[PDB]
Amino acid sequence: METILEQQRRYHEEKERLMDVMAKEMLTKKSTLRDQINSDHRTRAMQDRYMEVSGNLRDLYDDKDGLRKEELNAISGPNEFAEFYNRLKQIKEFHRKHPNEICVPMSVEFEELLKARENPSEEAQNLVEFTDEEGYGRYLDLHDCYLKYINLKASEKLDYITYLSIFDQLFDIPKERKNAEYKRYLEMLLEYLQDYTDRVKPLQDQNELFGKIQAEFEKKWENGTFPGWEERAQRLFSTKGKSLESLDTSLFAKNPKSKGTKRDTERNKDIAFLEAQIYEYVEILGEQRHLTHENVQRKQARTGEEREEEEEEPYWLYKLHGLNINYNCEICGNYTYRGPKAFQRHFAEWRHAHGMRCLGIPNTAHFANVTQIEDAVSLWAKLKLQKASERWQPDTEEEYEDSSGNVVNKKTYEDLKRQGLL
Amino acid sequence: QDATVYVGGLDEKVSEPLLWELFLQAGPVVNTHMPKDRVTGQHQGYGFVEFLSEEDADYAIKIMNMIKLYGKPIRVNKANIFIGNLDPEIDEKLLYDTFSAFGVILQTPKIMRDPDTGNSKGYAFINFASFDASDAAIEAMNGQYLCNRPITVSYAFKKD
Amino acid sequence: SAFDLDVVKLTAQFVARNGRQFLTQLMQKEQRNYQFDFLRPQHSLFNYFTKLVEQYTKILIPPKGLFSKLKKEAENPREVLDQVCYRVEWAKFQERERKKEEEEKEKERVAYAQIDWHDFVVV
Ligand SMILES: [Zn+2]
């Protein structure tokens, strides 16, 4: 197999087709947010497929460095080419043209008029990744988080506006203790906010953003990211102040700070990372949180009907010529025909021939004035028997006397004679 | 329709038994049909020959194609620019290849057909890429010697 | 049409490894009693065979995957998005140039159909 010649060119053609499909998707205008989110998800899937194809093609270079000495040699050539042509010299009886060598990846990376989705992305749906209250990235669902916060706080003195004001803080004082059970709800709220940020922009590099967030949490947040003018340096895990930078560096490797506490850097590192991720998601998606707060205020200020509307978004010839007397035929869909002059003519017309073909019986003068099915099939059996009888069938009707005994056995049919003479 | 062959380009010398006698050497032509006009009461140049087998109709279409019968381009077939008095022996691909020498064609051309026979009406419509190809067709192709039929190219729509 | 496409792909793979324009693995095969009608430029398949030979020559580039590894197209979606935006801008510029050429052709057709063709002067 030509893995360096044919497979690399096929991977390059697939990458060029994916880039052309991405350019055609980016050049087309958008009219709705859900269709734009679906197009962005399809472009992200096509970019992931192109990255996988490039990673598969980039690993096919180990044998190429060994085969380049034999491929670039001018001493070789038409011997192996003539051997491959003799291998390609098989029977050409498969008379079938295949124009889908390059047209099939072009049609797989395209959409239809009824549904604007690609062929690998035909099973993708925007309702399986986002809820109806989010609006495909327009707002964020915070009713379940507010219910969980009200269940954890064990008090009914916190509304949605108070929860939105408590969630709007980034570096202020927290509402509850850092070593309490609110961190288990904050980690779930951060894991939901990370999925909401990854769903609001599928075309952005999530791995590079996660690596940048991890680098900012390790190199900056773990080394005093909030300087002061106890107020000079504050620790997120130990929740205590520091006199200077040397005292904080000496206390960073201390025994209560490493593992000798309940909020040290060994056990409470994941909660601090989740809090940093929640702060980064609140700083990156503050406009979506403000839009969700404005939508919640508009839903609270509205009435019941406004909220329902927001959630819903020659009579003599008649009897002289034969009319008023109707006849029906089962062979013709129980089609009821009018006066006899038309009824007698219908057997020759198209509809009756069609109805008769359904059973497989030809239209002849024998099957006239016959309107029922079973009568037709019985008369067809009769006519078949009659005609088949009255013909001359030489196969069963013939007297051969084979030369096996040559003076006996004249009861041989026309088939046993061939079997004896074979 | 498969066993019958539609003949186009018949003059006044050709008749209904004459086409059956001329098509008798190609195959067993069972019947001949000639639609008469309403204003003149004669044949419009297009007729049909219903044979017994489809192979005889295929041989008549492959043998009597673009023939000069009665001083007319008779041809048998399987039954903004305006071109008139065109020969029925040419197809859409043949007209596209003939129009490709003057200018570039935007798409595949279409030829008008009769509602009864459906082989050839007599006029066709073709669209060019620009007005220069239309002017070259009105200067050169409007009057060129086609296959035994003087065609006439004209503008379909023009604004004064 | 699979056998002819495979023969054209084999000819494009054997002709891309040549060290000269006429000293290839297909010019000597023509004198070796091997019928190959796709080598002549008069056939319509020669335009596809030339594109296949160009793709085989572009598959032998040093950034094509022979002695180097691509990092921008394989490990950066933002570079691919910028390349797609540049391709869309180039397609929009080509469409604008085609519209300008069509407008110039319409202006030339309007000027040619309005000039006086009766003022003839033979010098
Ligand atoms: Zn009936």
Author numbering:
A (entry chain C): 1 to 229, 279 to 362, 393 to 501
B (entry chain 4): 11 to 89, 101 to 181
C (entry chain A): 160 to 282
Article passage:
Among the five snRNPs, the U2 snRNP plays essential roles during the recognition of the intron and assembly of prespliceosome. The 17S U2 is regarded as the functional form of human U2 snRNP that directly participates in early spliceosome assembly. Three RNA helicases – DDX42, DDX46 and DHX15 – are found to be associated with human U2 snRNP, but their roles and mechanisms in U2 snRNP and spliceosome assembly are insufficiently understood. Here we report the cryo-electron microscopy (cryo-EM) structures of the DDX42-SF3b complex and a putative assembly precursor of 17S U2 snRNP that contains DDX42 (DDX42-U2 complex).
The final sample contains U2 only of the five snRNAs, DDX42 and protein subunits of U2 snRNP (DDX42-U2 complex). After 2D and 3D classifications, 430,443 particles yielded a final reconstruction of human DDX42-U2 complex at an average resolution of 2.7 Å. Compared to 17S U2, the conformations of SF3b, SF3a and the U2 snRNA in the DDX42-U2 complex are nearly identical. The most significant difference is the presence of DDX42, rather than DDX46, in the DDX42-U2 complex. Our DDX42-U2 complex likely represents an intermediate state in which DDX42 has fulfilled its function but is yet to be released. Compared to DDX42-SF3b complex, the N-terminal sequences of DDX42, including the N-plug and helices α−3/α−2/α−1, remain bound to SF3B1, but the helicase domain has been displaced from the C-terminus of SF3B1HEAT. In addition, splicing factor TAT-SF1 and BSL of the U2 snRNA are recruited to SF3B1HEAT, anchoring on 15–18 and 18–20 HEAT repeats, respectively. Structural overlay of DDX42-SF3b with DDX42-U2 reveals overlapping positions between the helicase domain of DDX42 and BSL of the U2 snRNA. In addition, the helicase domain of DDX42 also overlaps with the Linker domain of TAT-SF1, which contributes to maintaining the BSL conformation.
